[model samples]
Target: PQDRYKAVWLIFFMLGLGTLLPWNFFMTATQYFTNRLDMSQNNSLSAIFNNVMTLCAMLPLLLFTYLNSFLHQRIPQSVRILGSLVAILLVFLITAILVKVQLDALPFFVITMIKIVLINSFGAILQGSLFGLAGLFPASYTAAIMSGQGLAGFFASVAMICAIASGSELSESAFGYFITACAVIILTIICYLGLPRLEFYRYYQQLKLSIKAILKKISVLAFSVCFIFTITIGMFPAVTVEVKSSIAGSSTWERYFIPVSCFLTFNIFDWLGRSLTAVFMWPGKDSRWLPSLVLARLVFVPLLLLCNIKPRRYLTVVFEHDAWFIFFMAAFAFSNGYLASLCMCFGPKKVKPAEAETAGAIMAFFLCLGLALGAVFSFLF
Candidate 1:
């Protein structure tokens, strides 16, 4: 419907920018703290940070669930518009303040915790809410919105690479701070200016369902597959850092370039992989048993072996040079993204629409769990 299009566009852009900015900042900020801030390289400390951050990541899912329920039940239609505006503005201001403070002091551990808490707790809730909004459309439209989010993420990575290349220091760099601040301000302005004064509640009637009933409705197998997919994806960041550190010996500009290269590789293969799935993987069928998915998992076995065997010298050659390693890493990243996307498509096909949301929430929770575990394992190993 025309009405839904307006909601979809509003949510798409807001979610796209919201998801992109915080993710870019988080990756850059964590690297900055560990490499430049003279922080102790204690494994336990790193694990603590990772665990705390991972827990913070789940706050949004819970928050969005509650918010969705509240809006559906108690909030008046007219007031919802004002509430959304205020919420967006508040989130923007809080995030900006947090970033500015961190940039100013570079208070390593404390600031990192603050960043994780702010971004995950508030930022994720807003992003997740946008996602839920997108789901208000037809399946095709929902897929398009998700695809758009992925593309936005890819572009955001490119933008961050450009920012870093342009001599924006992580610490003591007013230019970088200003750029980020301006982005936040512009995003807020867009939300205020473009979003119409409308009140629409599509899922208000479903708020009365019990938790147990919700879970029973979701397909167990699909939920499990999604959980696995999310866990694997969440582990990629820590794995990426480990792989780079092993190769580079230190976190330098070259090491920082790893994510950029990974992004480029991921987008290319990700697009290809999704296309292949769409072409080959039959919907509402038992596609999980396909040979492709099986082979993809097996490929990881060799990758794990390569990682272990080469721990130091074998990959050192590529790691020592930023350009070379980025290329190498990009190749691996492409495979990772492709496989992950395939897994996601495979996981959700069997579930009902409402169950899909619940399953997704569970997957997200497990993702944070995996990240916490990966951070710990990264330190110990």
Candidate 2:
């Protein structure tokens, strides 16, 4: 039993590593695809592809839910574990292949779509499993796990940025993809070898029924929160594209200025926002935090509107000074991050434990959906 528990812990660590690798790839690849492929960075086509990928990814969740309902009781625990392992292995293989291909020559639309499907499907399962496992632990422990995962992602992003800075121009670059692919392969192997057969459903007798009840209870509210999350996420890629285009006519330094500013704002405020959540918003204990978060959301409306508004009185010198824009961007980043954490805490408190993973998954799905939609809206409008 001790060995079993040790194996479980090993599995969890590998999963955490796997989760960080693909996540960073997904985030950074948006920049790579747009910059390298001449894909319209914030256009309707990119938006549509993003939305389609999101919808495809959600299909697996629904399938998994149904399987947990109908077949979970029939399937032996060993069989399920073996099946999951196989799936994980296959996904890693596909991702490895795609990364190689994407590096050799940028894939066409269909190929890109295939890559998206593989990444999203595998990534979602890995993430969902992590969240589900978290429920088995104490809240403090779970918070630590979440923090660890977030920090891993941050470090991965930092590495990518450093590689890009030191490597060739992004369009001509293969190092980023190669490094990412190697990382994914190595982590997948570690996870496959180290992970135990986690009998996740053993604790609850009516596992399927509990999951269904949870889903039914929070269906509406979950979807709403998911939509809001998706929209907010959609803005970043769109904004990145817009910033890139706006400064295209200027020097390379000027072109990078806005993204640099946004990155600084994001980094500075992200940790601060998380800290505020820990200090002030007591998860499952504070109702006041919800109102504060909602108010923050309202504040974002005006800031977003202002962001859309063009500079009526153009000062070339003012345009050149990008630091002036950091205040608005920083505020937006801080509020958005804070609001998201607040919403995550709020929904679970308002609902059931079984519902939490579903809620989180839906939120993620919506975030990606909104990102895709926001890009389209920005392009068309």
Candidate 3:
């Protein structure tokens, strides 16, 4: 049946958006974290914020994502998806309320990490379930979801840049971010509830998929997806956030460097790359060139490492200019979204139609596995 008004596609797209929005918004609030966590502590918590945040977020994310595949057998999608959303909504609400209250830096940082862990735990369930759900649809719909995820990052980064550019108080801007996340989650829940009323959605919901040797079918693509994120997350926000503007002295460029150059630039290009795949999926499903391109992404890690990341102990900056960093980020971020989406899009298609849902779930597990591994390994840098 035709997706009347393409409502199924649009609803899943928004679901994808909600899946990543909270995490992206938390990561983008770099300035707010620094202001709150750097007070009175001899050791700078903000210095290691990405490492800790990534660890706390990715570990539970990886754990719960794997559990979700099993949970699928016992729990209904309505319980898992809706319950997870409501849990995340409450967590973000708590986060928003705490923004204005002053507290000890150590306790605040610890509490914040706890919240990060909780959010990602629920986020994993939402992501895995949605991927499994989307896998039952046409491949184009999966691309819609992937594109929406890319835009989640783009939206958060853009909002953060706006807050900085507007000279709003850091705490004030952070409170606004939390509120925005809550609003988006509410909309997502409405869309999800409304989805069943659509004829297109009802038809898809009744048809279930099969599972057997699904791992064998998509193993290579899964590995490529995992490795792709490993290389990207190993440097992003952690190493990327550390990069400084080459221009000296106090200037608007220096102030705007990380938000505009690092965060915003990566997100926009990443969105463009994901969106492009909906039109032309280069390196056909069976092509060796696809994983080859995935392997090629490794070069970006070293290339970005050579950029002007401040307080380097050993590695000398070769690419010292802002132009160089921006160019590297654009290429790196674009390839990340393009290749990752391609891997996901190809995974289900490689299997029997009945096994696509399992293929999708396994692929999501590997993807988050890569994220978890990369987040921990990032500490080495």
lDDT of 1 by residue, 1-381 (tens): 354555644444444444545454555455454444344442445545555665565455345434543343254422433344345445445544544453422345665566455555544444433433333333333333344445545655665566566676654332354356446536644654444443333342133244345445333433443443443444355554444333455556463645554555555554444334433444333544443453444344235324422245444232344454455444544444444434344333335555444433433333334444444444433
Please state the error at residue 103 of candidate 1 in Å: 9.6
Best by TM-score: 3
Error of 2 at 366 (Å): 6.4
Candidate 2: clashing residue pairs, number: 4
Candidate 1: misplaced stretches above 4 Å?
Answer: 2-14, 39-108, 172-209, 220-225, 228-235, 244-257, 267-286, 289-298, 301-381
Q: Lowest-lDDT window of 10 residues in candidate 1?
A: 199-208
Better of 2 and 3 by lDDT: 3
Q: What TM-score goes with each of the models?
A: 0.62, 0.64, 0.93
Report the alpha-carbon TM-score of model 3 versus the true structure. Answer: 0.93
Instruction: Output the better candidate (2/3) by TM-score.
Output: 3
Stretches of model 3 off by over 4 angstroms after superposition: 40-49, 209-212, 247-250
Off by over 4 Å in 2: 1-17, 31-107, 145-149, 156-160, 167-175, 181-228, 244-250, 271-280, 283-288, 308-324, 345-381
Order candidates by TM-score, high to low: 3, 2, 1
**Between candidates 1 and 2, the TM-score winner:** 2
